[PDB]
Symmetry: D3
Subunit: 152 residues, 6 copies
Amino acid sequence: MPSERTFIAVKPDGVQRNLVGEIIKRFENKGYKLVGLKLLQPTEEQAKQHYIDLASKPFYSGLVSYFSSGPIVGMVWEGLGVVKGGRVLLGATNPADSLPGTIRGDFAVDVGRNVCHGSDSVESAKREIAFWFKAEELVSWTSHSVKQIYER
Amino acid sequence: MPSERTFIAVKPDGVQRNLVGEIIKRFENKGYKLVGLKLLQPTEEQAKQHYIDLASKPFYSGLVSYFSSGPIVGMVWEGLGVVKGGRVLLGATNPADSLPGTIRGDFAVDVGRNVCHGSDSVESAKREIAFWFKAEELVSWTSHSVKQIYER
Amino acid sequence: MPSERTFIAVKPDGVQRNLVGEIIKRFENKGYKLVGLKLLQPTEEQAKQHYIDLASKPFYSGLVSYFSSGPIVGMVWEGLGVVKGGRVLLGATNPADSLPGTIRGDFAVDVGRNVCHGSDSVESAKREIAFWFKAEELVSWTSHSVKQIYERA
Amino acid sequence: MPSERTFIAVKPDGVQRNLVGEIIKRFENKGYKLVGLKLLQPTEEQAKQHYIDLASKPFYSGLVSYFSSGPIVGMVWEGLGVVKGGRVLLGATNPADSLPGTIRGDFAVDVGRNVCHGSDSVESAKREIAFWFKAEELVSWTSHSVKQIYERA
Amino acid sequence: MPSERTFIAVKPDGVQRNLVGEIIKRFENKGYKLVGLKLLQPTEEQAKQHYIDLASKPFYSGLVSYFSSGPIVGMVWEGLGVVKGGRVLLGATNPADSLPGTIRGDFAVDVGRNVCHGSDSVESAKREIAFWFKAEELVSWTSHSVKQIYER
Amino acid sequence: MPSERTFIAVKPDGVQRNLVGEIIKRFENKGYKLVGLKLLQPTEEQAKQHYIDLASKPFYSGLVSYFSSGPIVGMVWEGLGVVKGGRVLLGATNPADSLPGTIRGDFAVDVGRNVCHGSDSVESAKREIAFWFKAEELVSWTSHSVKQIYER
Ligand SMILES: Nc1nc2c(ncn2[C@@H]2O[C@H](COP(=O)(O)OP(=O)(O)O)[C@@H](O)[C@H]2O)c(=O)[nH]1
Ligand SMILES: Nc1nc2c(ncn2[C@@H]2O[C@H](COP(=O)(O)OP(=O)(O)O)[C@@H](O)[C@H]2O)c(=O)[nH]1
Ligand SMILES: Nc1nc2c(ncn2[C@@H]2O[C@H](COP(=O)(O)OP(=O)(O)O)[C@@H](O)[C@H]2O)c(=O)[nH]1
Ligand SMILES: Nc1nc2c(ncn2[C@@H]2O[C@H](COP(=O)(O)OP(=O)(O)O)[C@@H](O)[C@H]2O)c(=O)[nH]1
Ligand SMILES: Nc1nc2c(ncn2[C@@H]2O[C@H](COP(=O)(O)OP(=O)(O)O)[C@@H](O)[C@H]2O)c(=O)[nH]1
Ligand SMILES: Nc1nc2c(ncn2[C@@H]2O[C@H](COP(=O)(O)OP(=O)(O)O)[C@@H](O)[C@H]2O)c(=O)[nH]1
Ligand SMILES: [Mg+2]
Ligand SMILES: [Mg+2]
Ligand SMILES: [Mg+2]
Ligand SMILES: [Mg+2]
Ligand SMILES: [Mg+2]
Ligand SMILES: [Mg+2]
């Protein structure tokens, strides 16, 4: 269904390096619909929970520290296959494996400063959206271009 | 002083026409610092108040209805001369009078569908910011590029 | 009215210098609607007629020769104030006078290699459209974005 | 040979979504030469014939209906390997399979709203060019950049 | 004559903020021909002489210090009216007076961090080119597009 | 290590076709640091040497003649994995094999007119840098964004 949603965040390095507009532009250009957007400063506990699956990994403390060091831009995007599509737009985890055309391919070098985050599955997207956004921060609306973007 | 702030909004037509990222990019490119950001659908009362100085104008009810018809993106930008600078970036109120290079000059035709709003003075900016954002919704942070952008 | 139309051409230097897509993008980005488009090679006589008002000027023979030297892209754009607005997008006739942001400001140097043409009035746009396009070559259609671009729509 | 040609179309969704200039820019940027261009509204029968090989597919009637629902921009591009190369610029048929950098990768979501068409072989490109363009509508010209783009030239 | 030349430099803040490519692109797009290009670290004495006319102005010490604080990219561009045209591309001295579309209009805020320099007259361009470039660093060549850019 | 360096050149066709700025922009956007830059017309002997590994190939004399036919822009870039990363940005040697998003994928058609060169290994990069640049022509400096681009 085109009502699938994903959580995308410009990480603190992406905000610091002025990539918020560029990232949003790429999602808008694709045809995805923006339904949540905010600037916020994650707390360390928020970072810990967001990345809870990686708690035993040796880079976790540094990841959690960095993610809560400065503002991020959190987003919710809606569209057909938008979880997979968002990841495609972002590129590989390690920017050295990412291809030009992707966000990490064009703008990042180091796996620990890879500019952006995107949910990796439909289930994790639901958890992340619910973690970062209140219901009143998600806007239900209809794109005037929906029939131009979707056949059904 | 570099701590001046202004309120910029992408209006519903700007959101619908996929100009959010482009608009944000222009403010980031200039050196301005994003300290507040949100997506929300104005209520009719918010629309009325935001445009309260125009209540006696014959286009008011249309303006209010349209401004409350779907999501806007509200933003707070910080920088030296950012109120005036934001308006320079936006272009003339009537896109017919706006020059190429500006947001309205590049992307709009009609005065009633002119994509974006910006505060018209330091004082009106303070009032708009106070109206659209709670204290806890602004993020204070230091651009790592601040010494590259400002002499003092 | 939003149904006003203008004729814009990418001149032979514009085609040669790969500016067709860039020029079309600027018009699309503004909200104008493309209702006629073609690539053609003007004849010298077509050039002479298109610029007939300028027959006495010293630059006319070179203008007419160049305009017919290779392909142009001819366009009809429709929108509110599109005659004046198209010319604003093009920038000043002499690129030395044009401002960055405009097509001539960004991409051209010399008044004789100024990349593009736009009709100078509502009446001349009508004449130019009728000169370059047959009735059946225009396409009338409704932009899905018309109510986002126009308040009255 | 550098004189190979292909047919590329911006489909009605591409025109509606203001992608004509962007698509043309990508082809110009690559070094391909534009030798035919027009805006037209296909008839349903023209659509049926253009996609005749796909008549048995379950999506055919919707494809043919949509393709004839509004204007397309039809193009003939010329260059070395332009049939294959044009398709690479377009990206995978289904945009979910297309990579960022390509037209479908950057701008489309749904296989039925995939913004553009490109001929799939040298022989089908010949057939498509002849179907959509009369001989006198093509413009043969020499790019001033031909020796910068091609070693053999 | 189309053989006029000017000196353009990306100043240390422009290099630091990754605007070298963008600036070069704008001059290439216009039709101007690049005939000299280099990355170098100005010395303080070099900065002093480059800005010698401003030696009595109260910002001179800071200007000279900043100009020699980091690398610049020096360039020589050739074309009809390229001294005036280069300045047009750069925008006003003070970015707050510069219009969108120009280099300072799009990318700068503060007069003391205005990203780029351009010679202000034919005579000063000649002095600057001769000061910053050796003869062997200027390349004489012919653009394959010269007949497309110039009528004569 | 982040101090790896590579040699990238815009070839004469790339200079003639106004791609210098675009190419530089792509390397800047990625996070790589420009430490050497110059415009020069290679001599025939420089062309022969630069491409010395291909002396026995049948396209050598054409390659050498063309590479020495007008100006190139020579560059030295510094960053983690920059040799491999530069080549990823450039795309496949034959533009027919190169993907959109890369320099050759976006801008070239013919293997003999493929716009740009990049060193193929850490060692060949060191040799190319040493061949094209004098010690005094490189500039060492610290990007103000280094902590935003690199974790360590
Ligand atoms: N330093 C370091 N950071 C890593 C490594 N792997 C992942 N990260 C960081 O941890 C984040 C989360 O990892 P993961 O969920 O597997 O990747 P993602 O979903 O692609 O971001 C990544 O985006 C990186 O910022 C690593 O090996 N080293
Ligand atoms: N229909 C219509 N709308 C107008 C007119 N003047 C202003 N507006 C709209 O009302 C908004 C608020 O007007 P104003 O505060 O005076 O201009 P701004 O601060 O430059 O946006 C403008 O941005 C326009 O969208 C008008 O004469 N007619
Ligand atoms: N060489 C030369 N060409 C000119 C001059 N004035 C105009 N032109 C060319 O003639 C075209 C037609 O001139 P005009 O209709 O007056 O200006 P436009 O409507 O703004 O294009 C221009 O677009 C230029 O290409 C001139 O003084 N010298
Ligand atoms: N709904 C739908 N449309 C399809 C499907 N496959 C192809 N199409 C559409 O039909 C067009 C023609 O298909 P085809 O010629 O096989 O692919 P192409 O040559 O890569 O465009 C495609 O470009 C799509 O727009 C499908 O499975 N479902
Ligand atoms: N702090 C400060 N710097 C200035 C002022 N005026 C000029 N500058 C700097 O000095 C440089 C040289 O001044 P000038 O030659 O008059 O301007 P330009 O030719 O437009 O750069 C400018 O580009 C600015 O970087 C000023 O009033 N205050
Ligand atoms: N004409 C021709 N040129 C070639 C061929 N292979 C390589 N070249 C050219 O020679 C240059 C050097 O080749 P090589 O070092 O193998 O490739 P690179 O390091 O990927 O550029 C390439 O960039 C091409 O421009 C070929 O088969 N034919
Ligand atoms: Mg993950
Ligand atoms: Mg106002
Ligand atoms: Mg005229
Ligand atoms: Mg097909
Ligand atoms: Mg000066
Ligand atoms: Mg090699």
